[PDB]
Copies of this chain bind each other. A is one copy, B any other.
Amino acid sequence: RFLKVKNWETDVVLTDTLHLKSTLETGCTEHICMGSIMLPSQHTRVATKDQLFPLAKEFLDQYYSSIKRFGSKAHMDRLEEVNKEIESTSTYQLKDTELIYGAKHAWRNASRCVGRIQWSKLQVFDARDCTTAHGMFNYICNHVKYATNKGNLRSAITIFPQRTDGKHDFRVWNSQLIRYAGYKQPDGSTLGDPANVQFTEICIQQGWKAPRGRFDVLPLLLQANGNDPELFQIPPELVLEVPIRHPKFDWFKDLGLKWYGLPAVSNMLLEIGGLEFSACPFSGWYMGTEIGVRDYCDNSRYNILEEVAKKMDLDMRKTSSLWKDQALVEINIAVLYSFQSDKVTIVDHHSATESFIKHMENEYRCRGGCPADWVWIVPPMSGSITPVFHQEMLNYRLTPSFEYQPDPWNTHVWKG
Q: Are B385 and A383 in contact (CB under 8 A)?
A: no
Which residues of the other chain, B, contact A389 by a CB distance below 8 angstroms?
380
A105 in contact (CB, < 8 A)? no
Which residues of the other chain, B, contact A34 by a CB distance below 8 angstroms?
33, 394-395
A393 to B94, CA, bound (A): 40
Q: Are B385 and A293 in contact (CB under 8 A)?
A: yes
Q: Are B394 and A383 in contact (CB under 8 A)?
A: no
Q: Are B394 and A351 in contact (CB under 8 A)?
A: no
A382 to B19, CA, bound (A): 32
A114 to nearest B CB, angstroms? Answer: 14
Residues of A62-116 at the interface with B, using a CB-CB cut-off of 8 Å, are none
A31 in contact (CB, < 8 A)? yes
Q: Are A329 and B325 in contact (CB under 8 A)?
A: yes
A150 in contact (CB, < 8 A)? no
Which residues of the other chain, B, contact A30 by a CB distance below 8 angstroms?
25-29
Which residues of the other chain, B, contact A9 by a CB distance below 8 angstroms?
298-300
A61 in contact (CB, < 8 A)? no
Which residues of the other chain, B, contact A25 by a CB distance below 8 angstroms?
30-31
Which residues of the other chain, B, contact A396 by a CB distance below 8 angstroms?
31-33
Which residues of the other chain, B, contact A38 by a CB distance below 8 angstroms?
6, 8, 392
| Contact string against B for A residues 30-52, beta-carbon threshold 8 Å, 1 for contact and 0 otherwise | 11111111100000000000000
A299, A300, A348, A384 interface centre (most CB from chain B within 10 Å): A384
Q: Are B31 and A35 in contact (CB under 8 A)?
A: no
Q: Are B324 and A340 in contact (CB under 8 A)?
A: no
Q: Are B336 and A322 in contact (CB under 8 A)?
A: yes
Which residues of the other chain, B, contact A345 by a CB distance below 8 angstroms?
none
Q: Are B380 and A381 in contact (CB under 8 A)?
A: no
Which residues of the other chain, B, contact A300 by a CB distance below 8 angstroms?
9
A391 to nearest B CB, angstroms? Answer: 8
Which residues of the other chain, B, contact A33 by a CB distance below 8 angstroms?
26-28, 33-35, 373, 394-396
Q: Are B351 and A294 in contact (CB under 8 A)?
A: no
Which residues of the other chain, B, contact A336 by a CB distance below 8 angstroms?
320, 322
A395 to B336, CA, bound (A): 36
A350 in contact (CB, < 8 A)? yes
A154 to B351, CA, bound (A): 42
Q: Are A5 and B37 in contact (CB under 8 A)?
A: yes
A27 to B294, CA, bound (A): 31
A181 in contact (CB, < 8 A)? no
A378 in contact (CB, < 8 A)? yes
A130 in contact (CB, < 8 A)? no
A5 to B35, CA, bound (A): 12
A380 to B380, CA, bound (A): 9
Which residues of the other chain, B, contact A294 by a CB distance below 8 angstroms?
384
Q: Are A385 and B328 in contact (CB under 8 A)?
A: yes
A34 to B328, CA, bound (A): 31
* Cross-chain contact of A383 among B19, B22, B383 (Cβ < 8 A): B383
A326 in contact (CB, < 8 A)? yes
Which residues of the other chain, B, contact A22 by a CB distance below 8 angstroms?
31-32
Chain B residue with Cβ nearest A23: B31
Which residues of the other chain, B, contact A31 by a CB distance below 8 angstroms?
19, 22, 25-26, 396
A399 in contact (CB, < 8 A)? no
Q: What 8 A-B pairs are tightest by C-beta distance, nearest first?
A: A35-B35, A28-B28, A36-B374, A380-B384, A320-B348, A33-B395, A28-B33, A325-B329
**15 further contact pairs, Cβ within 8 A, besides A324-B350, A329-B329:** A19-B32, A22-B31, A26-B31, A28-B32, A28-B33, A28-B35, A32-B395, A36-B374, A319-B348, A320-B336, A324-B382, A325-B381, A380-B383, A381-B383, A383-B383
Q: Can you list 16 A-B contacts (CB < 8 A)? A: A5-B37, A26-B33, A29-B30, A32-B394, A33-B34, A35-B374, A293-B385, A297-B384, A298-B390, A321-B333, A322-B329, A325-B382, A328-B382, A379-B383, A380-B384, A381-B383
